[PDB]
Recover the amino acids of this structure.
């Protein structure tokens, strides 16, 4: 069939590295790109095509229990080892990541249908907001 | 509420760059990471947390009509300009991307519930397989 309609989830990707290198892609981009999986949404009407592709990355699970310090390796970030301790402050989840980096941690809390996440390292604060599906 | 259960879709991300720089993240990784959106799946049982995060990237739409040559800028790859011509060979969609790179194109076809994609540049072939949702 010529009908390529649908959403297609990548299950295999061979020699993406060599294709990317043939295209002169920066080796730092290739090292990240070879990790990605793809979802392709094709809307097709006869010979008219619209191909909508999204690239996706694993990220490691993080499991913890409040009050129990755990070892965390920040793969997908700086790949460092920290000793993380999560505690409640009221309804705010507070994490201190003890390690090389000073003032490293995060705070996580719900308000309404929104999840707030504040990440700290040194004097830098990154504020992320998520909406509930 | 202390109940952080659910799947949470990132809608905002401020100063991720400065947080990442404070963590000494390679500037090539930061240039890609600042583009990503996040989906966070939290399974929470009391004070026991499992946080499953996936990072996601836009990728530009590509719309075309078979037989009509179109200009394509390969953002998300080498960011080059090519003149793309897509044609049918039986049930196989064949694209030649005329430009600086020799033997650059792709072939795309259905077999069963699987979509096959072969990308070529120079003497390099990348073969991708997708499964229908």
């Amino acid at each position: 069939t010529r009908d390529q309609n649908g959403t297609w989830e990548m299950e295999s990707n061979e020699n993406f590295e060599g294709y990317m290198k043939a295209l002169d892609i920066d080796f730092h981009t290739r090292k990240i790109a070879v990790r990605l999986t793809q979802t392709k949404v094709i809307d097709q009407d006869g010979d008219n095509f619209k191909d909508k592709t999204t690239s996706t990355f694993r990220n490691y699970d993080v499991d913890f229990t409040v009050g129990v310090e755990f070892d965390e390796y920040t793969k997908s970030l700086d790949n460092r080892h920290v000793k993380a301790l999560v505690t409640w402050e009221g309804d705010v989840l507070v994490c201190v990541q003890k390690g090389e980096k000073e003032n490293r941690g995060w705070k996580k809390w719900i308000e309404g249908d929104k999840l707030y996440l504040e990440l700290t390292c040194g004097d830098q604060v990154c504020r992320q907001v998520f909406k509930k599906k």
Chain B touches chain A through 78 residues (CB under 8 Å).
